[PDB]
């Protein structure tokens, strides 16, 4: 009560935060290039800036607290956090990150297929599953791992990029259950998500094993995972009855095909991955391995 939780109000001064450009709106809120020029002289660094589209109190609430998981991470391969903006004369909230020019890596393996193989497809997946490492030590779930949600630094780096439904585990279990679900990224989940609302690391594993076949599609056109999910269902199928139908389909081992071009040792970590027995699936750390493993086997 007495003296209210630390913050810097100084660090991004509205007035010094200038706008270059809307960048994408979405689920995730809104988010824009800005320059922050506290010297007025047309300089200073670029960074992204995160917004809410709807400054509900609920949503404001949920803001504060993906901010503070984003500053207790510092990892190469997570977006970088620097501070908030407290606009609106501090009667509002926004979040200051670095600014990573390629954008998501699902846009990015559709704009730039001419500099994408598979060593790179290889070196992004590394990233990401050291991300996942470094998350874990946190006991952080990160709910959300696409393709969508990793951003683009230069063609050697990614760096996992949206925190909005990352959920911190309870101190004495291995689970999160989440209680007022919202929008869920259903082709993503592993089925004890979508049967029990349970997240864990190994749920995480799960998606992370989708955003590898994600990288091997290319983001293909009819190949992303809710495109050969509904085919695999019915096309014609809509509400309630898609879910019943994946659940039923992922409890009895239908999976997604292995993308074309795609090496079997690839699938087959995909495959792994996909275990509906949540004890063994691979662990982040293992998979960093085998993957970085299978780089360094090549020639050269
Ligand atoms: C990305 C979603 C769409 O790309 C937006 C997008 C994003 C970036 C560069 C280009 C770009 O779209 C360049 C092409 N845009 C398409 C429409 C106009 C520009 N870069 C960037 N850098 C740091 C943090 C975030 N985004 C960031 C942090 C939290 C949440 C998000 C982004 C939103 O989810 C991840």
């Given at each position: 009560?007495?003296?209210?939780?630390?913050?810097?109000?100084?660090?991004?001064?509205?007035?010094?935060?200038?706008?270059?450009?809307?960048?994408?709106?979405?689920?995730?809120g809104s988010?824009?290039?800005?320059?922050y020029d506290?010297?007025?002289?047309?300089?200073?660094?670029?960074?992204?800036?995160?917004?809410?589209?709807?400054?509900?109190?609920?949503?404001?609430?949920?803001?504060?607290?993906?901010?503070e998981?984003?500053?207790?991470?510092?990892?190469?391969?997570?977006?970088?956090?620097?501070?908030?903006?407290?606009?609106?004369?501090?009667?509002?909230?926004?979040?200051?990150?670095?600014?990573?020019?390629?954008?998501?890596?699902?846009?990015?393996?559709?704009?730039?297929?001419?500099?994408?193989?598979?060593?790179?497809?290889?070196?992004?997946?590394?990233?990401i599953?050291?991300?996942?490492?470094?998350?874990?030590?946190?006991?952080?779930?990160?709910?959300?791992?696409?393709?969508?949600?990793?951003?683009?630094?230069?063609?050697?780096?990614v760096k996992?990029?949206?925190?909005?439904?990352?959920?911190?585990?309870?101190?004495?279990?291995?689970?999160?259950?989440?209680?007022?679900?919202?929008?869920?990224?259903?082709?993503w989940?592993?089925?004890?998500?979508?049967?029990?609302?349970?997240?864990?690391?190994?749920?995480?594993?799960?998606?992370?094993?989708?955003?590898?076949y994600?990288?091997?599609?290319?983001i293909?056109?009819?190949?992303?995972?809710?495109?050969?999910?509904?085919?695999?269902i019915?096309?014609?199928?809509?509400?309630?009855?898609?879910?019943?139908?994946?659940?039923?389909?992922?409890?009895?081992?239908?999976?997604?095909?292995?993308?074309?071009?795609?090496?079997?040792?690839?699938?087959?970590?995909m495959?792994?991955?996909?275990?509906?027995?949540?004890?063994?699936?691979?662990s982040?750390?293992?998979?960093?391995?085998?993957?970085?493993?299978?780089?360094?086997?090549m020639?050269?």
């Amino acid at each position: 009560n007495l003296y209210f939780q630390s913050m810097d109000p100084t660090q991004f001064e509205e007035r010094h935060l200038k706008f270059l450009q809307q960048l994408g709106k979405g689920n995730f809120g809104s988010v824009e290039m800005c320059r922050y020029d506290p010297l007025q002289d047309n300089t200073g660094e670029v960074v992204a800036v995160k917004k809410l589209q709807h400054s509900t109190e609920e949503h404001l609430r949920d803001f504060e607290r993906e901010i503070e998981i984003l500053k207790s991470l510092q990892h190469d391969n997570i977006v970088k956090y620097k501070g908030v903006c407290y606009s609106a004369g501090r009667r509002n909230l926004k979040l200051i990150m670095e600014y990573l020019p390629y954008g998501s890596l699902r846009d990015y393996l559709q704009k730039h297929k001419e500099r994408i193989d598979h060593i790179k497809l290889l070196q992004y997946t590394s990233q990401i599953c050291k991300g996942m490492e470094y998350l874990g030590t946190k006991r952080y779930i990160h709910r959300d791992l696409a393709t969508r949600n990793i951003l683009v630094e230069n063609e050697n780096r990614v760096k996992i990029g949206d925190f909005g439904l990352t959920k911190v585990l309870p101190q004495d279990k291995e689970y999160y259950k989440v209680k007022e679900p919202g929008e869920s990224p259903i082709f993503w989940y592993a089925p004890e998500s979508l049967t029990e609302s349970k997240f864990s690391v190994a749920s995480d594993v799960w998606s992370f094993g989708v955003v590898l076949y994600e990288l091997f599609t290319y983001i293909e056109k009819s190949k992303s995972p809710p495109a050969e999910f509904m085919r695999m269902i019915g096309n014609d199928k809509q509400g309630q009855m898609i879910v019943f139908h994946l659940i039923e389909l992922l409890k009895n081992n239908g999976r997604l095909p292995r993308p074309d071009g795609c090496p079997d040792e690839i699938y087959m970590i995909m495959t792994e991955c996909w275990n509906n027995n949540v004890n063994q699936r691979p662990s982040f750390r293992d998979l960093a391995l085998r993957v970085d493993q299978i780089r360094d086997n090549m020639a050269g």
